[PDB]
């Protein structure tokens, strides 16, 4: 089980959740990013993806996987403070992938915020 | 002459390396030179020789 996997996050503008999994997704543990008492304008922190990143990473305890190769699929304030700060656990982050959804003009997008 | 969409070798120096097409301004060609090269790109990109994204 150990030494391989994907630290599958999707770092949104609020509540960048972290789900560690394998290289074929099975989600050994995940972490809700509001687990540090972040409720309103608070999960958009560096620290929502610093310690709640390792509230499932340091508390993995199931595979003991060490090579993580974290993957991000969205923009957020805790994005650069997620891939750095999943390695706040010190879990040898190796291969970050910017495989984000880029639709070739996918649908009809919503309205401007006045 | 016209560039076919199988001579990628004199065509891939105009493409973007991570899936897209670089423009004509930074590539240094004319407009008909770009547009007939774009048909070679398009019939390579849409028809799986060049990809869209991976």
């Amino acid at each position: 089980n150990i030494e391989n996997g994907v630290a599958h996050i999707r770092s949104t503008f609020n509540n960048t959740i972290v789900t560690i999994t394998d290289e074929f997704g099975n989600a050994l543990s995940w972490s809700s990013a509001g687990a540090l008492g972040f409720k309103g304008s608070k999960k958009s922190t560096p620290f929502a993806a610093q310690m709640a990143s390792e509230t499932a990473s340091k508390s993995a305890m199931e595979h003991g996987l060490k090579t993580v190769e974290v993957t991000v699929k969205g923009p957020g304030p805790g994005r650069e403070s997620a891939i750095r700060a999943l390695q706040s656990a010190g879990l040898e982050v190796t291969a970050i992938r910017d495989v984000t959804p880029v639709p070739h003009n996918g649908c009809r997008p919503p309205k401007r915020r006045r | 002459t016209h560039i076919d969409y199988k001579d990628t070798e004199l065509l891939k120096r105009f493409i973007s390396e991570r899936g897209k097409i670089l423009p004509r301004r930074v590539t240094g060609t004319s407009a008909k030179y770009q547009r007939m090269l774009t048909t070679a790109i398009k019939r390579s990109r849409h028809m799986a020789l060049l990809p869209y994204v991976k």
């Binding site: 650069e80 750095r84 291969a95 970050i96 992938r97 910017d98 959804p101 880029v102 401007r112 | 991570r18």
Partner: protein, 52 residues
């Protein structure tokens, strides 16, 4: 899609933020937030480009 190894994480963070920089990926999901009308999408295509 860019793996940064044989180094520390700082230039890897400065690769990931640069791979974000040299991309129509984060700019595209910045482009695709809301709708601009085609009476005003050419205002972006002129005031940024016809002046360049």
């Amino acid at each position: 899609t860019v793996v940064r190894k044989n180094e520390s994480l700082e230039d890897a963070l400065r690769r990931f933020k640069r791979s974000v920089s040299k991309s129509g990926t984060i700019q595209e999901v910045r482009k695709r937030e809301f709708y601009e009308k085609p009476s005003v999408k050419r205002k972006k295509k002129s005031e940024a480009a016809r002046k360049r």
